[PDB]
């Protein structure tokens, strides 16, 4: 199917408690494969998936060089943004950045991404054209001017269409037994009375990969969006994910309700009912 | 693999 690679950088200032922390993690789809943390006793790029371990010393050395350089650059950037917003030196602030490439089911580039935030709000993003920027406010417009002057977009584009795709394809091959395996949800419906005249039906999905899934309840074939309690998809810790969706129904009407499950790992969507 | 030189310029 379709696949993506993303890197997630977080740089966080903490006045009075040392220099800002820089952390980078890398993902292919929902599988993390590297980390770097400037607060580690000996900061270095570390493997987080078995299939990346085969990369040679030069790979790890280059990654670590890059992340050490970024640690310093992002510290300067934090300083710069504090000034752009006329902020005091007292507060803690965060730059986040997420970038990477999406491939279609043929392995071809679908599109690239390179987006940044400041204190959790959109700051600047590379447009889908990989050539122009969208700045969120007059501060980010300063960054935009700087990056336009230095032709930064051209360099980001070169990476996103080149090395990004090339490495993602390599990772997909090296990790093909896991990265290219969809594990379907294991499903069941539970029933608990909430009183004499109502009961909760809960539709479960467990053990699935990747995390993308759709779980819905219908009553008489009609979507029950407003009446359904849906929890956030959550990681099990063994690579797989879990989710449930619950509806409270009048006692005696249980068979009018159906749970529908869509997942990459399923040929055809499932329809489930409570089975007393 | 992360991007390298394209990340040289500060914000």
């Amino acid at each position: 199917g379709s696949h993506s690679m993303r890197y997630f950088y977080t740089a966080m200032s903490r006045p009075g408690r040392g220099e800002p922390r820089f952390i980078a993690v890398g993902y292919v789809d929902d599988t993390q494969f590297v980390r770097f943390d400037s607060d580690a006793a000996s900061p270095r790029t570390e493997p987080r998936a078995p299939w990346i371990e085969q990369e040679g010393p030069e790979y790890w050395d280059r990654n670590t060089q890059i992340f050490k350089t970024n640690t310093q650059t992002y510290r300067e950037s934090l300083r710069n943004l504090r000034g752009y917003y006329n902020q005091s030196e007292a507060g803690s602030h965060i730059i986040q950045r997420m970038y990477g490439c999406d491939l279609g089911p043929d392995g071809r580039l679908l599109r690239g991404h390179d987006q940044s935030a400041y204190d959790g709000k959109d700051y600047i993003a590379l447009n889908e054209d990989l050539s122009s920027w969208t700045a969120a406010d007059t501060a980010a417009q300063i960054t935009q001017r700087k990056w336009e002057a230095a032709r930064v977009a051209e360099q980001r584009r070169a990476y996103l269409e080149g090395l990004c795709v090339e490495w993602l394809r390599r990772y997909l091959e090296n990790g093909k037994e896991t990265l290219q395996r969809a594990d379907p949800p294991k499903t069941h419906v539970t029933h608990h009375p909430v009183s004499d005249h109502e009961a909760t039906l809960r539709c479960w999905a467990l053990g699935f990969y990747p995390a993308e899934i759709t779980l819905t309840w219908q009553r008489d074939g009609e979507d029950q969006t407003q009446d359904t309690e849906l929890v956030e998809t959550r990681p099990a810790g063994d690579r797989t994910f879990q989710k449930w969706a619950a509806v409270v129904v009048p006692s005696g009407e249980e068979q009018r309700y159906t749970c529908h499950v869509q997942h990459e790992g399923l040929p055809k969507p499932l329809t489930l009912r409570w089975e007393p | 693999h992360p991007v390298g030189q394209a990340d040289y310029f500060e914000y």
Binding site: F8, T10, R35, R48, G120, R234, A236, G237, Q242 | -
Partner: protein, 99 residues
């Protein structure tokens, strides 16, 4: 501004009394990233809890999974206790094997 954490407490595998499992506390949707999470057994902090590496969702909110090995029993109570700048007091969510 700031976003308060969502919290879910649950097990890696379906719970069977007397069978070793993992107890999970997933915190998500929060900002900024500093957060304090404890797993509790009968009210007391479990030592040596591990956690995932800090990452974030498309909306920039952070998430972390905290986890430890545990063997559920009929009588033992488990919970997750979370503090964050958005919370005036720590929030405790009990482990319920049906959630």
């Amino acid at each position: 501004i700031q976003r308060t954490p969502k919290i879910q407490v649950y097990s890696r595998h379906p719970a069977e009394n007397g069978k070793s499992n993992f107890l999970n506390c997933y915190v998500s949707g929060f900002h900024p990233s500093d957060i304090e999470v404890d797993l509790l057994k009968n009210g007391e902090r479990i030592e040596k809890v591990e956690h995932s590496d800090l990452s974030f969702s498309k909306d920039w909110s952070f998430y972390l999974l905290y986890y430890t090995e545990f063997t559920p029993t009929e009588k033992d109570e488990y919970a997750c206790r979370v503090n964050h700048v958005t919370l005036s007091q720590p929030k405790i969510v009990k482990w319920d094997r049906d959630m």
